[PDB]
User: Which sequence fits this backbone?
RNA sequence: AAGUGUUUAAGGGCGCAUGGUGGAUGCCUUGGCACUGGGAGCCGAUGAAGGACGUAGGAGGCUGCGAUAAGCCUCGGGG
RNA sequence: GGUGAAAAGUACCCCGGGAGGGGAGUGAAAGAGUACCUGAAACCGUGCGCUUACAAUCCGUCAGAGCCCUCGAUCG
RNA sequence: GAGUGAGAAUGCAGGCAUGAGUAGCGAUUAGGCAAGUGAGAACCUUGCCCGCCGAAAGACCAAGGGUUCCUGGGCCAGGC
RNA sequence: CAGACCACGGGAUUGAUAGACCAGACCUGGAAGCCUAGUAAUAGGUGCAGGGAACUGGCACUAACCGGCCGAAAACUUA
């Protein structure tokens, strides 16, 4: 048992915290339910997660022959990536710093036929 | 036509009336409108009152309809085509449905239609 | 409402910090030579 | 009003865990023969087809 | 009826396995600093030092060059 | 400042518009993929064993039952 | 033979937490509907409505920037 | 009429919960048209007329949907 397939997406333009917020809603669920959820969610940050899950499913189906009907999200990291720094003027000449954060999504889907 | 009971839909006052008028015009012209949830809710009673005025339309009602709608062709079609089409329905001519929200601003989107039966 | 104390201009710029005015006087020539020795791209305005 | 001291890791995470989202309820709907999940709010629109299904 | 009695983690803490950000540590340089022995120590109206412009068949820089414009003529080296 | 001895810089297939990723290849190494020698500290995640929702702790120390992993012959 | 041992000099260089996923997203006018491009559209293109300036929030020049001017292509980076 | 969000209260086809329609109470003042007197503004009959949102009673005409998730017992001693 324990057949798994991984899928990564690096340099995503989404904050790590906002990505984990949506991940927590799908961590440890079937692939069908995961694709069903994250499509009607109001947060406009579930599209990368859904794309990564779909890519993982396609890879597991085209490289391991695993039936997509028995796939479940086994692990997900959604780590933080590089952060581009920039400046932003203010009231009295002071220069504030704005951080353009990113994210590195990582998922591992396995088969758990009950 | 009940007061909104709170902050109006379109910015400050004097704009919600024009917004509702334009929405009722588009509805009576096309047969179905897709707007924001609260906008459709505020339009429902407005459109129903306009439809009741059209139904009762014999004289002095065209004036009441024109003091709120400006499109002469829209008024003419609402008076002729619709006309007695709702002469049997004792109210409730506008059906409201909710659809998925749009990108950017997560505004609940609704759709209004004219019952045909 | 201040003018920010810049007031861009080409004629006055060249007349007050131009090569001719810098070469007229001795101190200006010395400054030009110092800038050339330092290697500045634009010696004068 | 300014922060006097540095909030501890626990004091920060205990409240950061509250900034979460609530998943919406789903409903099975038969459209074009295939079954798909759509919230009960858009259930009615799913029948008429006013809800695009990617 | 009285008494005893393990059983929950919205989240945090502790130690470990896995990882991202991060560019220090370790190993090197086409570079930089200080001196040894020599050459030569002024360049110019027969237009100096330094710059604008242009030059390869091609969008910009470095360098050479000056409408004879990454080159022209003569004389030696190597191939 | 430094990929790698040599670009030999992943043909081709799959998700997608790409970014990027998974197989299939080169390279000894891809825990060397033009974000590239070695890759620490603070920060951020995930999983694992204990802990806590009657509790007023410069946030440690000395005692100390239970739980967890392991070396020997149920104890030391 | 030391440029040889940092925990501080409101010490300097590079990265990251707290404040917080909070404020703010920069006036005195206000957007709405239909069709279309596009995988992705309230913010892109066409049509119909409502609103603002109209001694201008219109047009032409002086100073100033110098190819932002027009056509085809692109949405990493910049539009708060 | 409960309320920043939350939460509270009523309903969900076995229903008047809300929107629409009818009627009532109430507010406003005599609506558009016709005709009449006045060259004229203007007034008079159609007219307690026309218009209106919160208050009230009927009316399923429209929306509460062929709909989704949590959610119930170690054990032992004495009387
Ligand atoms: Mg020292
Ligand atoms: Mg230190
Ligand atoms: Mg606060
Ligand atoms: Mg872009």
Assistant:
């Amino acid at each position: 048992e324990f057949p798994s397939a991984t899928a990564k997406a690096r340099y995503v333009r989404v904050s790590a915290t906002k990505a984990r917020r949506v991940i927590d809603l799908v961590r440890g669920k079937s692939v069908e339910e995961a694709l069903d959820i994250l499509r009607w969610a109001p947060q406009a940050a579930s599209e990368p997660v859904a794309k990564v899950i779909a890519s993982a499913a396609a890879n597991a189906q085209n490289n391991e022959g695993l039936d997509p009907s028995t796939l479940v999200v086994a692990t997900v990291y959604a780590d933080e990536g590089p952060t581009a720094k920039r400046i932003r003027p203010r009231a009295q000449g002071r220069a504030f710093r704005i951080r353009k954060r990113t994210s590195h999504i990582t998922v591992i889907v396995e088969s758990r036929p009950p | 036509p009940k007061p909104t009971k709170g902050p109006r839909l379109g910015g400050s006052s004097s704009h919600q009336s024009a917004l509702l008028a334009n929405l009722a015009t588009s509805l009576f012209e096309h047969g179905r409108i897709k707007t924001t949830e609260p906008k459709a809710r505020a339009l429902r009673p407005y459109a129903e009152k306009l439809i009741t005025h059209a139904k009762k339309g014999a004289l002095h009602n065209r004036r009441e309809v024109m003091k709120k709608i400006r499109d002469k062709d829209v008024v003419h079609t609402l008076f002729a085509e619709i006309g007695p089409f709702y002469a049997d329905r004792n109210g409730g001519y506008t059906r409201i449905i909710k659809v998925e929200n749009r990108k950017g601003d997560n505004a609940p989107m609704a759709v209004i239609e004219l019952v045909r039966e | 409402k201040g003018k920010r104390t810049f007031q861009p201009n080409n004629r006055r710029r060249a007349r007050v910090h131009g090569f001719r005015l810098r070469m007229r006087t001795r101190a200006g020539r010395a400054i030009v030579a110092n800038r050339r020795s330092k290697g500045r791209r634009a010696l004068t305005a | 009003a300014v922060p006097k001291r540095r909030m501890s890791r626990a004091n920060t995470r205990s409240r950061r865990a509250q900034w979460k989202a609530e998943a919406p309820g789903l409903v099975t709907v038969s459209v074009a023969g295939q079954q798909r999940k759509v919230p009960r709010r858009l259930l009615k629109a799913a029948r008429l087809g006013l809800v695009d299904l990617d």
Chains C and B do not touch (no CB pair under 8 Å).
